[PDB]
Every structure is written in C-alpha cells, then in structure tokens.
Ligand SMILES: C=CC1=C(C)/C(=C/C2=[NH+]C(=C\c3[nH]c(/C=C4\NC(=O)[C@@H](C)\C4=C/C)c(C)c3CCC(=O)O)/C(CCC(=O)O)=C2C)NC1=O
C-alpha cells in the first residue's frame with residue numbers, strides 16, 4: 138500500500154474510504170479496555186510505558202509503575218521471561234504465565250519482544266485442546282478443500298460458541314469469498330457471498346501475515362491510551378501488532394457495529410508465506426475469549442493452513 | 453504379515469524372533485497396571501469386562517462392577533459419553549472427562565468405541581499447549597525435512613522431559629534410520645543409526661497407522677488381565693489397539709529392558725495414509741506421561757506429519 142499516515146496522535150489525517158489502506162493500524166498508541174499493557178526495556182526490565190487503566194488490573198498507578206523493574210514487579214517471572222525472549226527472537230514468540238490477583242480467577246500474562254522492547258499484556262481469566270485433537274480426524278478425512286473448510290468452521294464454532302464462523306478465502310485480486318460457514322440457528326447466511334478487497338485493506342493483510350490472530354472483544358468499547366505514547370527507547374511509536382490487546386482500527390469497529398457484531402476475532406490461514414484466507418468469527422454481544430482458548434485457535438489455524446496446502450495439492 | 457496367531461490365553465504358540473510378526477498385539481486381554489479399564493455395551497451402558505485391578509482405582513470389586521450400567525456408575529458422564537461416541541464413529545475418537553476420587557489429584561477417564569463396545573480407561577493424574585503453539589514457529593521456519601526433524605525432537609524433549617527423543621524414519625524396505633535426536637547430556641547417540649525391519653514388525657506398523665500413540669509406562673510392570681477375557685457381545689477377544697493402557701508386547705518389553713529403557717512412548721508420523729516414521733521416546737526410569745500431555749503430543753504428531761509432507765514437497 139501507499140506509505141502509512143502518521144497516527145492521529147502525531148497529527149495524521151482522518152481516515153476515510155479513500156485513504157484507509159494508509160491507516161497505521163499497528164501503532165494506535167492504545168489498547169482494548171479488558172486488559173492492561175506495559176512495555177519494558179529488554180535488558181534492564183525497566184517499565185517504559187503503561188496503559189492508563191493499569192491501576193484497575195495491577196493495583197498501582199501508571200505513573201508509579203513507570204521506571205520500576207520487572208525484577209521488582211514480577212520477581213518470580215522475570216528470569217524465565219528474560220530467558221524465554223532473547224534479543225532477536227521472533228516477535229510472535231510468547232512468554233505466558235498465570236498471576237494471582239485479589240479478584241476472582243487469575244491474571245494471565247502474555248509477553249512478546251519487538252527489538253529491544255518487551256510488551257506485556259495482562260488479562261483477567263476466570264477441554265479445548267482435546268476437542269482439537271478429536272477434530273483433527275475429521276479435518277484429515279475431509280476429501281477436498283471445501284469439505285475441509287466446512288469441518289473447520291464447525292470445529293471452531295464448537296470450540297468457541299461464536300455465533301458465526303466463516304472461512305474467508307482471498308482471490309488474487311484481494312476480493313474475498315465465504316467458502317464455509319457455521320452459524321447459530323436464526324442467523325442469515327453469508328455462505329457464498331463475495332466482498333470487495335476494500336474491506337480488508339492491504340496494510341491489514343500484510344500485518345495478518347505476521348501476527349496470526351487479532352480480535353475486538355467489544356465493538357463499542359473505547360480504547361485506552363498508552364502513556365507515554367512514544368517508546369522512550371526510540372522516541373517513536375510502539376509497534377503493537379503482536380499484542381491481542383492492540384486497539385482495533387476505528388474504521389473496522391464501525392463496520393462491525395453496522396453489521397450488528399458485538400465481538401470479532403480472526404485467525405490467519407497462511408500458505409507458503411502468503412495470506413490465503415481468514416477464519417473470521419462474530420458474536421452478537423461482547424465476548425472476551427480466554428487466552429488458553431485463543432491458543433487453541435492459533436494451533437487450529439496452523440493445522441488448517443497445512444491441511445489447505447495438502448488438500449489443494451490433491452488437484 | 454502372516455495371519456495373527458491366537459493369543460496365549462486362547463492356546464496360541466510362544467513368540468520367537470522367527471514368528472513375531474504374528475503376535476496378536478492388539479488383543480492381549482490385559483492392561484498396564486497404572487490405570488484401570490472397563491468395557492461396556494454401547495447401547496445399554498452395561499459393564500461387560502473389567503481389569504482385575506479395578507478396585508484399586510474405582511473402589512468396587514470387578515465382580516461387583518460387572519453388569520452395572522454406566523448410567524449408575526457415571527451418571528454425570530453417561531449422556532455426554534453416549535452422545536460423543538455414536539455407533540459407527542471412528543475408533544480413534546475419544547470422550548474425555550475428569551472424575552473426583554479419594555486420593556490426591558483426579559481420575560482421568562478416556563473412552564472410545566469399537567463396534568458396539570465402549571472401552572473406558574481410568575488413569576490417576578496429579579503449559580504444554582502454549583509451548584506447542586510457540587514451537588510451531590520454528591517448525592514452520594525449518595528450511596527442509598531434516599531441519600524440521602531436529603526442531604521436532606527438541607520440542608518433544610522440552611514438552612516431556614524424556615531422556616531421549618528420536619525421529620525414526622522408515623525406508624521402503626521397512627528398515628529405519630534415526631534422522632534426528634534430542635537427548636539428555638550423558639547419553640550415547642543413536643543419531644544416524646540404522647535398524648533392521650524386524651524391530652518394528654509388520655502388524656505393529658499396521659496398528660500404528662490406525663492408532664497413533666502407544667506407550668509402555670514401566671518396562672518391568674506386569675500386565676493386569678481383563679475379566680472375562682472375551683467380550684460377551686462377540687464371545688471373542690476385545691480389540692485394545694485404541695487404549696493407551698493396552699499391555700505392550702512382551703517381546704518389545706524385553707527389547708526395551710535390554711536397551712536400558714524404563715519407559716517408552718511413540719507417536720506415528722503418517723503421510724498420505726502411510727506410516728512415514730515415529731517420534732520414538734525413551735526414559736531411563738518408569739514415567740506415566742499425564743493424559744493432557746499425551747494429547748499435546750498427538751497434536752504435535754498431526755502437525756509434524758503435515759509439515760513432513762510440505763517440506764518433502766520442497767524437493
Ligand atoms: C461477512 C463479511 C465480512 C467482511 C468483509 C469482514 C472483513 C474484515 N475486515 C477486517 C479488518 C479491517 N478492516 C479495515 C478497514 C476497512 N473495512 C471496511 O469495510 C472499509 C470501510 C475500511 C476502511 C475504509 C481495517 C483497517 C481492518 C484492520 C482492523 C485491525 O486489525 O485493526 C477483518 C479482520 C479483523 C477481524 O477479524 O475482526 C475482517 C474479517 N468481516 C466480515 O465478517
């Protein structure tokens with residue numbers, strides 16, 4: 138696509154349907170409000186940026202967290218984290234831990250590394266893996282690509298309870314077609330419907346080849362800024378493509394609301410390094426899919442990508 | 453292979469190195485002693501056979517369990533179980549549940565269906581899924597088949613803590629070669645070693661194309677008979693290939709002991725319906741890998757099988 142615009146917080150232009158492939162969706166400087174996010178120096182563990190809602194989840198004010206080390210804040214996790222995510226590791230690699238907190242359930246921690254920055258996501262939480270193991274039989278025995286697609290969408294709907302699960306296949310002109318769909322009874326079918334390339338613009342497609350799962354938990358929820366908004370290491374925006382908490386493009390959020398969607402999630406299907414399609418999910422109401430279920434969906438995405446390649450080779 | 457012999461309990465001949473492809477390894481009429489096994493009628497749920505150690509795990513004598521229904525014994529699981537495993541479903545499909553019991557941890561239940569028979573395995577129990585999600589990056593980026601194999605064996609060793617993990621590839625003459633190995637420091641290497649076809653005889657290879665994971669938790673542990681040994685539905689032996697608790701061939705157990713192996717496990721690598729190889733694991737001491745970790749290994753096996761097919765196609 139044409140080069141990204143600056144984000145709105147650096148004085149960038151408003152997004153319209155004439156320029157929307159230039160929206161810098163990877164650097165919104167904000168997150169979805171169902172979790173908290175910190176960034177930290179990869180070597181010292183010093184906390185550099187904090188979502189403004191951090192006190193809700195972490196029990197300290199953003200301004201007080203700023204500058205504290207992960208050695209101090211997360212003493213039991215820091216050495217494991219530092220060892221798990223060495224300089225130069227893939228930016229999609231994750232360190233995951235479970236933390237205790239005063240509320241019901243636990244606090245899930247997911248960390249990844251971009252350059253010299255660690256990006257930490259904290260998300261409250263509280264059969265899928267075995268369900269996936271079982272589904273692999275029907276995915277394997279599917280005789281062809283479309284049969285595979287039909288199995289896959291039904292499997293994902295069974296795993297998640299999403300109201301609608303589609304397999305959305307890209308054509309070479311970047312238009313799409315819904316080639317399989319599993320949906321709650323009552324819902325109008327999108328099966329067989331085709332859509333222009335504009336709905337998933339080129340910078341989104343590029344991001345989705347690198348970071349294979351993204352979501353909008355609540356399509357009416359206001360984003361929460363990061364502070365400071367720029368990474369002090371670089372005095373430049375923080376890449377958030379690897380964080381599921383990344384704020385969704387407002388353009389896409391409006392699209393989803395217009396479609397009657399309360400929660401959205403997709404998983405990339407990538408074949409030979411190319412974006413083949415998406416497992417695209419909708420719910421009618423807000424829905425935060427727990428981290429362990431997302432992990433199952435990522436694993437299914439990888440499986441499905443390989444099966445697509447093998448079943449297409451049958452032709 | 454030549455037709456199977458009758459098992460020893462039906463007066464079959466002793467197994468030697470001259471006839472060992474005829475050992476009926478799928479119908480040993482016995483199980484490994486770290487769990488219990490029941491069989492039940494698929495329609496009524498009546499318990500038909502019981503491992504002789506059942507009281508250790510279930511708290512009722514085999515003779516008292518015999519004839520009771522799963523509706524009575526497992527009231528909370530029976531309808532789910534019956535719905536999960538309908539007549540004609542794949543014999544590899546599993547129903548899994550967690551049961552409470554008086555000892556520490558829980559009792560894992562795994563059920564599968566062969567014909568009109570349900571086969572129930574009960575096994576005491578007490579990060580892998582996410583570890584597998586992470587490993588998928590390195591498996592995908594592996595440039596070729598051997599690199600993939602090296603990643604896979606290291607991944608499995610990381611997931612399991614097994615002393616030795618090999619990728620054992622079958623040649624068209626059914627000889628094998630260790631093409632990758634991850635092993636604890638101190639252990640002599642089998643990397644690159646080749647082995648005659650006799651070590652994994654043709655009936656074993658056939659079974660391993662249908663039931664993709666098997667193990668011996670303790671290579672010195674005596675098997676526990678099923679009683680009655682024949683399925684009353686058929687007045688014939690009960691197929692146990694789908695049960696991880698199935699007793700291992702005594703010939704193989706002796707091989708493992710001679711090799712200094714205390715616990716063994718393998719996962720089939722199946723490509724286009726053909727047995728390509730095994731992920732073959734050893735431990736120096738007895739080791740019962742928990743059901744959820746086995747599930748992760750099954751999922752890795754499926755992934756790896758697909759990656760083998762894709763990486764081989766690069767040639
Ligand atoms: C049944 C039909 C159907 C379709 C066609 C569909 C499309 C779709 N769009 C997606 C994403 C984005 N779209 C746009 C931009 C625009 N979209 C427009 O229509 C115009 C107005 C526009 C700009 C002028 C942007 C910037 C993003 C990136 C969002 C981000 O990651 O921050 C996603 C993936 C995310 C997800 O799964 O929820 C999907 C699956 N989902 C459906 O169910």
Ligand SMILES: C=CC1=C(C)/C(=C/C2=[NH+]C(=C\c3[nH]c(/C=C4\NC(=O)[C@@H](C)\C4=C/C)c(C)c3CCC(=O)O)/C(CCC(=O)O)=C2C)NC1=O
Nearest residue numbers: 468469472477647651652656700701703704716717718732
């Ligand atoms: C480093 C080298 C190396 C090798 C070569 C190796 C082989 C191997 N044999 C396997 C299984 C069986 N073998 C035999 C029979 C015989 N085997 C023999 O040698 C002669 C004496 C013989 C009969 C005369 C039978 C009936 C079975 C089925 C067991 C069952 O499923 O009940 C397995 C899979 C099971 C597992 O992972 O533990 C493996 C991986 N495992 C290694 O580590």
